[PDB]
Symmetry: D4
Subunit: 150 residues, 8 copies
């Protein structure tokens, strides 16, 4: 990658539907060269895909949680427990962390009941779990994980 690739990525992280002509006009480079650079970024794994940003509210995902998990330590518990947490419907983020907790889990549900049934009731039966503490999100001030270049 170089300076040009970064300028292209800075645009694509926000609008993957911007036309080649418009991008070429903005960054000032041939459209053929632009297409070549983009294909190379995809081929090299820099661009792993293109997603539609869907408004969680439209799907009534109003029960947003950030759960901290304390594990029962054992050989390779981070991979085993991490994978069990990752396969729970509604869970989009699972992080192995340093601190008083071992994992931070990000999840979304429509209601308190769905959250209890799909998440809480599943987690309580996982053997590698010592206990968890769920922080309910009252307000999402910002959630733009797509922005990697500021």
């Amino acid at each position: 990658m170089d300076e040009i690739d970064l300028r292209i990525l800075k645009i694509l992280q926000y609008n993957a539907k911007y036309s080649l002509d418009e991008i070429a006009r903005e960054i000032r480079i041939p459209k053929s060269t632009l297409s070549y650079r983009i294909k190379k970024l995809e081929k090299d794994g820099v661009i792993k895909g293109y997603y539609a940003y869907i408004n969680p509210a439209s799907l009534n995902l109003d029960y947003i949680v950030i759960t901290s998990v304390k594990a029962k330590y054992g050989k390779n518990y981070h991979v085993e427990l991490g994978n069990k947490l990752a396969q729970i419907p509604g869970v989009w983020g699972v992080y192995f962390v340093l601190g008083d907790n071992d994992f931070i889990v990000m999840a979304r549900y429509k209601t308190r009941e769905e959250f209890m049934e799909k998440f809480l009731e599943r987690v309580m039966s996982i053997p590698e779990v010592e206990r968890t503490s769920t922080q309910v999100v009252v307000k999402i001030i910002k959630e733009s994980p797509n922005i990697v270049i500021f």
Copy 2:
């Protein structure tokens, strides 16, 4: 929205580049109807945009953090402190939460030094901050915020 819209969104959340012909063939509906439904979803704000999923590793974003923030309480501190945290370069997520902490901040940096300079040194001067506790992410087990329909 209806059952058809959900099937369309379930595909677009993963691959926004899938052709209309391929989607129409998969969900079994006219291409003209598909384009109409998609445009309506965009118009109604269900689909807020399309982003390229960039591999954070390609940008050397190896210093991943989840910071818990305790605020100095005051009238409307959640909005004021939330906005100050949201404008820090590298911060992609800011959540107002219930629990022993008031905000959870998600951020990415290339190094320990960049993290100290861009994030730590900025946060320590914000008047609404009482203190913070940063959990370093050793391993990202899963991070697919784009998936809203499981």
Copy 3:
């Protein structure tokens, strides 16, 4: 329910002994209609009953506690442990909660000794309990659970 039902309930939550004539005069509706609406609210389960508010002090219930419970996680522990806590004499409230604790228990006793014997000594033998932390209530500033309409 409608606006009228709410006005009736707002009165009944405070004084269930208020005469039909007095209520009818206050909210301005026929006594026959009032009786009909009240019976329907009872039939529909909105009004589950009528209780006498007894002064806990008259019964010497001076040892008031709010106990936080950490559970030993397992399949359906919330229902099993919750029910074991609920059947302890003196316990009037049991809540399954989110946070560093799993249950919050509200109880009343006449003395420290009765509290130890009836509550502490029973809880310590429950297998689903990891540990508990009891907060002694020094002063009840307010306790009006009967008020559901402010």
Copy 4:
């Protein structure tokens, strides 16, 4: 009070609408004597009133919280802060407690938004508040504060 008064109260705490004839038949005492004893209990302040038990669900009170409050210490802060917390719409219980927190607050709201606006946004501006930690109630296992005699 005596043994008879306790038997009367044990019934009234559950059903304040039970007829005098039925109560007299159950506890085995003259109806005239029963009415006299009941009036004396009311006069002496043992029975402070009669309330209708309304199903919180019927009022859509699905956002149930138990908030722990850490105060900024000062002369008589327990009374001053306690009273400010007690006047917040939706708050039915305020307890001055011993432990790592100073007050425990019980409240009910219909939604996350109402909770933020009516409770969170009011509490954050109270000068006597250092900070709070809210535990969201996922499931009410038991809530029968009316039972004072087990």
Copy 5:
């Protein structure tokens, strides 16, 4: 007991060697009556004994600790664990408490090594112990447990 007994006890809690003549002169009562009252207080168990207050420093007891204990819950653990803690040489106080810990232990030793050997190494092997947290006393501001009447 009466007002006179309290005046006698208020003196004896400080100086058990004060002569009968001096006490009688101070509180203004016959020496014979004084001796009678004192003997009755001893007989009734109010006065359980007389001890010499020895300066801990003279015995080089410079390692003063207050240890909080978290227990592994079980039937009657408070009595069983309490008694095991009470028999450890150097331990003078063992309290079963409410809060995040279950016991508070007061102990004195001459050195860090003696403390580790006599206390730490014994406690770590007790099955009813989950863990402990020891607070080292840097300075004793006050320690007059003999004063029961202020």
Copy 6:
């Protein structure tokens, strides 16, 4: 001090009323020598006094507490705050400690109300106090501070 002094002190810490003849017979030394050694121990400050051990229960001291105090740091706060805590009626022990808290306070009261009025209400107004956490003693397993020689 020597081996003989220790044997004398080991007896006096339990029974300061034991006669000279009985002590002399037990430890096997002349009564004149015993009296001389005892007087020297008093003169040298080893024996600071003699107290009557009064049963706290006889004085209805049923509200026993161990309060942890977090201070507002400042020059010499340990001495200033320590002395303010030490002069509160009912407080018999004040310890400056290492750990998450700065002082541990031992106190006794007859009731919850007396504890609130004499202790809680006084402590909340002390400027050097950040906050406190009170652990209520449910049961005193052991409290023999008089034993310095095991």
Copy 7:
């Protein structure tokens, strides 16, 4: 640096007094080349100096502590507070850290009194300090900071 430099450093980190002839014989290289490489490592700042490892016990440094510090946040508090902590006699390590605390301080003293006077009493007056928690080291299992190559 290369493989040879690492082998030289692996020896020097343990014994800086080992003769050139002995080192040359061990790693198998000319003494002249060895001296050249060592001088270059010193010149390049890899080897910052040579110290005598003194047994702390010989200096009666028996009061070993690890203190966690919570700071009062402000612009550049990490540098300002860090430097104030670093200049305290007895303090050999000061670390700015991530977590519930902001600094970890390593210090050694001969006694409890010296620790209180030189460290505690100085730290309590530093304006940037909110509070501290000192962990007393009962036993040093290992302390070989000189080993950088395992």
Copy 8:
């Protein structure tokens, strides 16, 4: 040891390469006497060795951690767990401590990955470990364990 030995040690703790002539000139004593005193200090174990102070940065040791360990209590766990922690490559300090944790571990690694593999993955399999909390060092303000005489 005496005053002269201390002056010699105060120099050697900083520069073990200072010539005998220079030291003798500085402290004002015969070179023969200086050599004798130094040899005696080594023989008596006061000076345990001489090490080269290597700049950790030169070895790319940028992942610096201070890990707190909670143990599963058992007979002699402090020695057994302490020794298991001490043998982990990268760990230079292991301290058995008083407080909410039982051990404090100091370690250095080149990267997050090396830290996870060499330290985290080894510690999670140790049976005596209940859990750990790692504090990442953002900045080393001071690290001069060689200074024992201030």
